[PDB]
Design a protein around this ligand. Sequence first.
Ligand SMILES: C[C@@H](O)[C@H](CO)Nc1ncnc2[nH]ccc12
Ligand SMILES: [Cl-]
Length: 167
Amino acid sequence: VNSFSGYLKLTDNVYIKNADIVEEAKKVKPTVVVNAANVYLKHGGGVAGALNKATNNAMQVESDDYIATNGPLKVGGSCVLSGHNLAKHCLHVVGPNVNKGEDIQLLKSAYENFNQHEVLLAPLLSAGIFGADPIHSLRVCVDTVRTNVYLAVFDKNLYDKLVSSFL
Ligand SMILES: C[C@@H](O)[C@H](CO)Nc1ncnc2[nH]ccc12
Ligand SMILES: [Cl-]
């Protein structure tokens, strides 16, 4: 039993809700919140910009030190950093950005990072401003993640579309 509330159950381990991931994280304070990161951990817009803003830019400061030490992530890769005031940990995961020409096949690799954590709050990877089809992202999530994932979909219209089309 966990403290996530109001989610629709899609499969044994995948759940979905129309919600602002920032407000969800502030309420639940999960062990792991997933950020829709880029390889430079530059949290400018979309989920990343919103999460970072909610940390008063502390996420960006921590991320800049991470990059200065380790260099960029790989597309499909991840790193674990602090969750600041939002969660215990933030799993920064880089899905392919279609608006950059990156290989959508890497979306499965991106979701594989979730399997290293028993429970996560997360967005749909490569959706939104990353330019991939969210219906496809949800399908890859369900077919790749085996741990317990609570998906927050900001757009109510898209949420209704994802549920009604879910196979
Ligand atoms: C891009 C997809 O992940 C989804 C599409 O609606 N975007 C979001 N989902 C949840 N919380 C969010 N906070 C800011 C953006 C956002
Ligand atoms: Cl977005």
